[PDB]
Amino acid sequence: ASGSFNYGEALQKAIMFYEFQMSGKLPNWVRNNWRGDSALKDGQDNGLDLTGGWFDAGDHVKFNLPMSYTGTMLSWAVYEYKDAFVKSGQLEHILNQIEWVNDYFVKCHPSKYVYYYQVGDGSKDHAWWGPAEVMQMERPSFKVTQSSPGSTVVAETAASLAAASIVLKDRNPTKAATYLQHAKELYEFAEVTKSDAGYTAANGYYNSWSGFYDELSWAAVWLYLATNDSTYLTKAESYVQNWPKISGSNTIDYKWAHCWDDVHNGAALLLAKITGKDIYKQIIESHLDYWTTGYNGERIKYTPKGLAWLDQWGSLRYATTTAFLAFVYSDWVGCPSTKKEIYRKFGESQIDYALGSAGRSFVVGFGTNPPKRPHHRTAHSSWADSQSIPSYHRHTLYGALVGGPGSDDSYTDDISNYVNNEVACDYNAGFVGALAKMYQLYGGNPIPDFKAIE
Ligand SMILES: OC[C@H]1O[C@@H](O[C@H]2[C@H](O)[C@@H](O)[C@H](O[C@H]3[C@H](O)[C@@H](O)[C@H](O)O[C@@H]3CO)O[C@@H]2CO)[C@H](O)[C@@H](O)[C@@H]1O
Ligand SMILES: OC[C@H]1O[C@@H](O[C@H]2[C@H](O)[C@@H](O)[C@@H](O)O[C@@H]2CO)[C@H](O)[C@@H](O)[C@@H]1O
Numbered sequence: 001a002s003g004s005f006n007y008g009e010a011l012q013k014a015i016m017f018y019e020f021q022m023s024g025k026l027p028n029w030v031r032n033n034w035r036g037d038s039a040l041k042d043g044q045d046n047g048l049d050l051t052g053g054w055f056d057a058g059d060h061v062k063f064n065l066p067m068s069y070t071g072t073m074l075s076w077a078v079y080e081y082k083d084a085f086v087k088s089g090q091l092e093h094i095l096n097q098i099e100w101v102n103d104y105f106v107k108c109h110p111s112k113y114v115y116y117y118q119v120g121d122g123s124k125d126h127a128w129w130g131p132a133e134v135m136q137m138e139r140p141s142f143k144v145t146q147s148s149p150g151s152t153v154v155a156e157t158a159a160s161l162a163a164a165s166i167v168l169k170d171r172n173p174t175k176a177a178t179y180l181q182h183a184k185e186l187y188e189f190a191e192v193t194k195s196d197a198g199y200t201a202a203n204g205y206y207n208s209w210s211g212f213y214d215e216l217s218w219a220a221v222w223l224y225l226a227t228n229d230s231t232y233l234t235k236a237e238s239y240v241q242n243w244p245k246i247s248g249s250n251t252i253d254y255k256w257a258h259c260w261d262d263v264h265n266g267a268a269l270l271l272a273k274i275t276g277k278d279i280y281k282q283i284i285e286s287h288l289d290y291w292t293t294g295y296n297g298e299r300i301k302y303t304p305k306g307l308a309w310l311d312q313w314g315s316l317r318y319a320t321t322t323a324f325l326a327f328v329y330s331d332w333v334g335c336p337s338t339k340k341e342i343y344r345k346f347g348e349s350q351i352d353y354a355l356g357s358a359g360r361s362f363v364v365g366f367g368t369n370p371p372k373r374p375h376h377r378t379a380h381s382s383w384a385d386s387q388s389i390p391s392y393h394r395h396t397l398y399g400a401l402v403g404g405p406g407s408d409d410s411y412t413d414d415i416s417n418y419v420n421n422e423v424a425c426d427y428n429a430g431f432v433g434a435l436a437k438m439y440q441l442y443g444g445n446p447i448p449d450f451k452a453i454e
């Protein structure tokens with residue numbers, strides 16, 4: 001331990017967060033004793049077992065686009081920083097979560113060109129405030145097919161399975177092989193269709209804003225790393241020409257973040273490492289420069305206390321994700337020497353901000369004055385379909401990164417504030433990776449064998 005925070009405790013808790021999001025019949029490896037079996041009929045309206053995976057946020061919809069982006073990012077964390085997971089004793093836990101979610105994606109892929117991308121209706125789910133185990137509303141399941149396609153979600157799910165096939169190969173080679181075959185098939189489904197016309201049930205929640213060419217690249221990169229089949233690298237590289245642009249221009253948009261919707265930055269970073277080509281270094285460096293010292297004279301907004309601030313809804317998610325990219329690229333022998341130190345220090349600053357450098361932790365159950373009322377139905381555990389009853393959450397959602405402060409560093413801690421005070425799979429995803437790197441650098445010991453037991 002040589003840093004400002006206990007990064008192993010933070011990593012351990014940030015992984016544990018996913019336990020609390022689990023849907024379906026809980027396996028005996030779950031550490032906590034307060035979540036129970038839930039959503040056991042998922043898929044039965046379509047004749048299939050679609051139980052499992054993760055509830056998305058503070059709700060009980062299963063939205064496979066952010067769920068699969070999460071899947072990919074957790075495996076990317078292991079891919080980069082396995083030795084940190086081994087040292088902290090956290091490898092088994094993050095692999096359990098990766099296996100869990102990719103098992104659910106396999107369930108969601110019951111015919112080559114049939115993929116279930118949602119379980120739950122946003123309207124019905126959101127209208128009730130109570131814990132998962134007692135839900136009584138209908139929970140329809142929704143699918144895309146060749147005639148009603150969803151290339152964005154299908155490709156992102158392909159990425160997740162390909163990445164899992166890599167990092168789970170040592171522990172479970174059989175399952176890793178299964179995941180790779182489903183990844184290949186899903187990738188073909190997304191390429192043959194190149195359309196999101198049938199991806200409708202997530203509208204209002206997780207629309208595909210940027211389109212699917214960023215996911216086509218990203219999934220092909222993971223598939224290349226899983227297979228060593230150079231066709232996938234050809235595709236990955238090719239689809240760069242159709243990546244999201246600054247509107248009205250031919251210039252790839254570097255002013256957002258790697259996130260559930262838009263994975264081109266991570267794809268660029270990995271293509272830079274794989275190929276060494278200046279084209280990809282130019283993409284990822286424009287982005288990381290914009291977030292740090294500036295690019296072509298403009299720089300992301302910063303709060304006074306040092307948060308790089310993209311948007312008021314899940315500001316910490318975007319900054320912590322960019323932190324992980326900054327660490328991965330700065331670890332690369334190809335990164336320019338001086339940018340190494342700029343990028344690393346930027347990543348440290350954003351993770352430290354999350355953990356409490358500004359005076360307050362933004363991670364549930366960790367640090368100084370952490371959030372106590374996250375917008376989360378199951379942690380709260382109302383018996384009265386009411387955010388105000390009980391006044392205090394029944395359960396502590398250890399490790400959950402909340403949305404984050406305003407652009408002036410302020411924050412409140414209100415159950416009703418889903419903009420600043422919700423928690424989500426995608427919010428924790430890059431954060432886990434960035435925490436592994438900080439533990440690698442600075443240590444801080446996890447709480448031995450910590451379990452969230454009431
Ligand atoms: O044009 C700016 C960038 O937009 C990116 O998409 C964002 C959407 O514009 C945005 O409405 C949406 O917001 C979500 C949020 O991400 C989620 O956590 C939450 O629960 O609900 C919000 C409101 O529905 O986010 C997406 C992704 O950031 C593009 O991805 C990007 O290419 C573009 O530059
Ligand atoms: O979609 C934004 C958030 O919605 C939250 O649900 C709201 C719902 O939108 C309203 O119609 C009303 O019913 O109040 C709900 C809160 O009790 C939902 O809980 C969050 O997960 C969403 O991000």
Ligand SMILES: [Ca+2]
Nearest residue numbers: 210211214261
């Ligand atoms: Ca996209």
